[PDB]
Write a protein that binds this ligand. Structure first.
Ligand SMILES: Cn1c(=O)oc2cc(N)ccc21
Ligand SMILES: [Mn+2]
Ligand SMILES: [Mn+2]
Lengths: 137, 137
């Protein structure tokens, strides 16, 4: 039986700016760094950055909707989003189709998101404003 | 401050086989489905499948090392790997690291993994046998 996400591994093209982005800009905890990667945590999430010569810097119009959302509190959301904006962090989506979210890109174009709220809260919101054809189990 | 992974969203080319894969084959809980996606959970993980015509069914040689690892106990690992093998699920890598790992592909070529072991376990092993260039914090 599967019990959750053990880790998220992101392929990166340049290790140093990617470590800086996740550690310095996003505030995640850096545990170790080596010539080809780094291990960070974000709460219980184990994040691995893996240096990969195959990774390309990808504009958001060239990638699909696969994305990674990080939890942030209602009290912290707006100022964190505004700080990313003021720092010049690129974006990829503006319309809030799944609640309170800020959509932004990492240095390689990985699609990231700040989101306020749990799955239970999103299901409750969807009952009132459901997506087309929505069924709840 | 970011407090964890809020959700993982995978773009999918065909919703029905992706739901069958994550719900029926992998045993995740299906909470809701709509015309263009689904919400599932796996322990604390909130997974969203998003129907996206831009998703390509991508051979593993054509994607980078970005991947998503799910937790499983050591005791359950071999029978879950055998379940995936019975269903003909392709493997994209052999394990050569600490902790059991099974590297498998979803219907669209998303790179997945079953892994046994925590970040703390990995860091302890790395302390004893550090990777090239490894620094701890
Ligand atoms: C700046 N820095 C650091 O904090 O840990 C490192 C490890 C390596 N391999 C190279 C550079 C660093
Ligand atoms: Mn999202
Ligand atoms: Mn892995």
């Amino acid at each position: 039986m599967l019990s959750g996400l053990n880790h998220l591994t992101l392929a990166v093209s340049q290790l140093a700016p990617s470590v800086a982005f996740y550690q310095q800009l996003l505030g995640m905890t850096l545990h170790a760094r080596w010539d080809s990667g780094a291990y960070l945590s974000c709460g219980d999430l184990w994040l691995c950055l893996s240096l990969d010569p195959q990774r390309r810097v990808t504009p958001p119009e060239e990638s699909d909707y696969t994305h990674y959302a990080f939890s942030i509190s209602e009290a912290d959301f707006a100022s964190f989003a505004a700080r990313l904006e003021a720092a010049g962090v690129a974006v990829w989506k503006l319309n809030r189709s799944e609640g309170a979210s800020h959509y932004f890109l990492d240095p390689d174009g990985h699609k990231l998101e700040l989101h306020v709220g749990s799955l239970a809260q999103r299901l409750a919101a969807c009952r009132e404003q459901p997506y087309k054809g929505m069924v709840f189990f």
